[PDB]
């Protein structure tokens, strides 16, 4: 909780530095974002992204291979892949069960298509598979962050 | 300027002042009626009348983009002083 | 030798905070032990470190 | 390019969706009334209420249709039309990834058959409509109120229902409990008069009479 | 136009039947909801509230409307029976904190502008 | 593209089974986490000494609303009521009037802080940068009436947090 | 809120890594908070010529939903061509 | 099939070790059910077309891996699952009978949406 | 003056690790059992 919540506070700092409030940005408006980022924001994002994986794996080692984290969570409440999609389940809930579906790739809104990334696809459809999918989504998120950070073009902020 | 009410309350720049009976004054006992002393009515009057010598004068309120939108007041009427509606500085021809 | 070095620094901060009285006052009132450069002083009486 | 601000136009998806619209119109002429595809490549199918179960099943089961995901289920109250309430079913395909929308109409009283069986996700969505628009659903497994407070009244999303509701609740020491009282605002909602009296879009002008 | 679709009941008689055992359930319920919810309501003054609410919608004559009131009372019955409802909501029918409202025109004129 | 997350099935040689039996019996991953948390124990504690030290902020920070004024001292608000028409929570109320001098200032300008949702829409709506949100967040009050601000209270806020707002605007007007 | 080498080696061995490369802390490497005034760029339609809004409006260039079939030998057509199969992860196919 | 694939990848269904005969029997059954369906119905034409095409390709190519490739339906397990669903659909709307003309027109302007 | 804003450095940015670099540490299971049994045996002696 607390170890990653310090990093969440670091995220809140960026939220504050771009929009003006650490939680409720009101940033992304119709016709593009409200206003440009402050100078130096990209560098701080770069440092945080450098430092984040070394604690993502740190959380993993505490939870992933632990006996009682798995035992309380592994193969409890299976959800069938067929019965998942009829139930209107979405997101990792689908990906945990095993359907290869993700709106970021199949129906790429904005510039998600130009961004290269793999999705974590579940194996047993249980609680533990979904948790691992969330963590692998953390890591692929870091890779996506690197890609967008390296290739931001020059242009206006609103239409 | 801020002046005291007959009861004793400090009148506001809008002219608000609770009257004699005016049961809604218990709010101020054991407290204070917050009034701002820097009255905008008089803090603009003592400013000097600018004597710029041209027919039509631009005014943004100072600070460029930080001021008010640029308005072109007309320094035509000889019997009075033109003023920007936003800020309020009085502009006048230098006695023609 | 960093252990005796940090011991020396811990005994140095007790001298930096105006001796024992100032150090104890700072510890009890501000919950702080370290000493920083005085970057300024306001009119109301607050030291900025 | 020449149009850097205007959104890109994808006519291929438009033609292909129109072809599938003609397909589905021919397959089920009993319930389908009017199919059309929007400019932004989103197809909508206007069906008769009796086709809530059949059409959906055909969209859920058919090999060449293959829609098994209930994205959402919604009602849109509009008091003007004779049957005020209109229900929208949003389906997403997996094998043939795409979004389809089927729309039906009902008034306050005429019930509309509950899907549930075609899409077991509809259930809770279904309840919402009943608890939010008054549209009762025939043989729904449990059509109890879902969202609003206990012992509520009316159906708030009805456009006649006031913004502030009818009754608030607050502590009363005289009875030592939270009690419900008729509405008495401390400051009334100011209803601004937007929608300037000048025509915006000549394309969507209503024909005269 | 005049022809319409029913919900359950075909004619006034069968909807009249449904309200019958709805009142049956409310009667058999009132005492043990007084007991269970620790109500300050009394048994008789519990039953008469049910009777007055049933008499409140006396003017209804359309069948479909009667099915609607009966199914809404059915939802009310489920909400009460399995303790999903709370004591305050049960009291909500009884208007305690609500001050008495005058009825005569003269009192209306004395109070303020209202029809 | 995609990656399978958990298909790494184990082998069954003597070495692998001995290792797994040791890990299950001689608790190892347990000890792994037990030692990681130890590493975090000896680390430098992340903690800011409030109120002696405050959290980092940005010049765009949205906080207490305030009514600024021109360098001449005249209030910038010309009561266009744009901010009232913008506030999604309708927390702003203005009554205007032709002043004794004439400039159309607000007879009443109150912001209901308990209705306000602190969005910064009013300042970006203001065409004279009259209404703004100061960097202050230290106005937690005791009575509900204390939160409901008045025109005089807003003017006092703009006259107390003024060097702050001027400096922040000077460092932010280019972005906006 | 760096430490002693004796503790530095203890935490690294217990954590089984070289954490000095990057700590959860953030030292002087942060971006300066007094950046120079940025000169923001402009958009495409900033020229003073051939910027007629008639050839640039997006809202005005929106037609009503195209009616296909109304109540007033073609083969079988699918809503979309069947979606292909994604590729395995080249980097880490299996975690 | 060589080594039969262990898991299809979707936990909602298992592997069919003999898929070709399953495709054959389900396709033949649904072709029978469409033979029930009257000739004039467009549903019978479209579904008989796609199904006889599918049966032709499945009986032509006997390699399962290429069967999925030219079947563009992923793993053969979800293909026979979809075939069962198609059978079910045809059977279920055999008596729904949608080939008839529209039940009735919508009432006046029930679809125009500028209000 | 030329237009400037928050931009990546011209050399882009340094690589950002995302692969799970969970470390591997520990003796062989045979070694662990052997050392436990040896400590036991010394204790019993
Ligand atoms: C086992 C315990 C052995 C004794 C304590 C040794 C110890 O940890 O010293 C700190 C010292 C440095 O710790 P660190 O967390 O790396 O310091 C990081 C910063 O340099 C820290 O920088 P800093 O500026 O925070 O350093 C100053 C700090 C550093 O702390 C000290 O100097 C504590 C020692 C007393 C002074 O001292 C203070 O702040 C003064 C207040 C001290 C509070 C009360 C301490 C009571 C200690 C026990 C008293 C007897 C019971 O420890 C070592 O170098 C390892 C010592 C291992 C001893 C093993 C013995 C078996
Ligand atoms: S931030 Fe200002 S404009 Fe926005 S809702 Fe709050 S008071 Fe109104
Ligand atoms: S937008 Fe600014 S000038 Fe207009 S009424 Fe509000 S505070 Fe006054
Ligand atoms: Zn001016």
PDB file of C-alpha atoms and ligand atoms in Angstrom, chain F residues 62-63 65 83-84 86-92 111-113 115-123 131-133, ligand 2:
ATOM      1  CA  UNK F  62      -6.084  25.987  -7.717  1.00  0.00           C
ATOM      2  CA  UNK F  63      -7.143  27.068  -4.242  1.00  0.00           C
ATOM      3  CA  UNK F  65     -10.792  32.199  -4.825  1.00  0.00           C
ATOM      4  CA  UNK F  83     -17.795  33.468 -14.268  1.00  0.00           C
ATOM      5  CA  UNK F  84     -21.350  33.016 -12.975  1.00  0.00           C
ATOM      6  CA  UNK F  86     -19.404  29.243 -16.252  1.00  0.00           C
ATOM      7  CA  UNK F  87     -19.248  27.789 -12.699  1.00  0.00           C
ATOM      8  CA  UNK F  88     -20.586  24.227 -13.088  1.00  0.00           C
ATOM      9  CA  UNK F  89     -21.715  24.217  -9.440  1.00  0.00           C
ATOM     10  CA  UNK F  90     -23.358  27.671  -9.707  1.00  0.00           C
ATOM     11  CA  UNK F  91     -21.454  28.714  -6.588  1.00  0.00           C
ATOM     12  CA  UNK F  92     -20.979  32.279  -7.911  1.00  0.00           C
ATOM     13  CA  UNK F 111     -18.825  32.439  -3.992  1.00  0.00           C
ATOM     14  CA  UNK F 112     -20.318  29.554  -2.049  1.00  0.00           C
ATOM     15  CA  UNK F 113     -17.136  27.678  -1.147  1.00  0.00           C
ATOM     16  CA  UNK F 115     -20.747  24.539  -3.473  1.00  0.00           C
ATOM     17  CA  UNK F 116     -17.476  25.333  -5.269  1.00  0.00           C
ATOM     18  CA  UNK F 117     -15.587  22.381  -6.719  1.00  0.00           C
ATOM     19  CA  UNK F 118     -12.285  24.239  -7.242  1.00  0.00           C
ATOM     20  CA  UNK F 119     -11.967  23.827 -11.008  1.00  0.00           C
ATOM     21  CA  UNK F 120     -10.375  27.094 -12.114  1.00  0.00           C
ATOM     22  CA  UNK F 121     -13.084  27.662 -14.721  1.00  0.00           C
ATOM     23  CA  UNK F 122     -13.886  31.122 -13.340  1.00  0.00           C
ATOM     24  CA  UNK F 123     -10.358  32.494 -13.767  1.00  0.00           C
ATOM     25  CA  UNK F 131     -11.405  36.389 -10.233  1.00  0.00           C
ATOM     26  CA  UNK F 132      -8.528  33.999  -9.553  1.00  0.00           C
ATOM     27  CA  UNK F 133      -7.686  31.096  -7.254  1.00  0.00           C
TER      28      UNK F 133
HETATM   29  S1  LIG J   2     -13.589  26.794  -9.143  1.00  0.00           S
HETATM   30 FE1  LIG J   2     -14.496  28.877  -9.177  1.00  0.00          FE
HETATM   31  S2  LIG J   2     -15.677  28.924 -11.132  1.00  0.00           S
HETATM   32 FE2  LIG J   2     -15.234  26.732 -10.714  1.00  0.00          FE
HETATM   33  S3  LIG J   2     -17.066  25.998  -9.575  1.00  0.00           S
HETATM   34 FE3  LIG J   2     -15.554  26.652  -8.003  1.00  0.00          FE
HETATM   35  S4  LIG J   2     -16.106  28.817  -7.566  1.00  0.00           S
HETATM   36 FE4  LIG J   2     -17.149  28.262  -9.520  1.00  0.00          FE
END
